[PDB]
């Protein structure tokens, strides 16, 4: 399912994740934006042969069961499909325990060089929440 924004925005926030670790909500509208442009189907495959799913583009090396990932941890206890589904609880569960990990948002490549910092409040802007 590709979402929107707002409707995004919304169901991050239903979901816990607004301030979650001191993370405001555009953080992670921001991140979903240039992780998978809102598409929860959208995979990509690595050069270490791990593969990244869903809208949080979560890592099958160490956060899920795809079964050709060898060395993989399944640390969130899911196969990498249920990441791509339109209800997204299991890509928030799943987020939680990531930004928990130590390095919070830093995890998310595309946070880090293209939200950081920056003015991620006008990710919500405009939205009913």
Known sequence: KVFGRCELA???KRHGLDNYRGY???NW???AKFESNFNTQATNRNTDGSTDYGI???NSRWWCNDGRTPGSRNLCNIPCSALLSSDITAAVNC???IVSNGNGMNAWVAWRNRCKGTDVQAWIRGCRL
Do not use: D, F, P
């Open 10 to 12: 919304a169901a991050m």
């Open 24 to 26: 405001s909500l555009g």
């Open 29 to 31: 509208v921001c991140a």
């Open 56 to 58: 949080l583009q979560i």
């Open 95 to 97: 987020a939680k325990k």
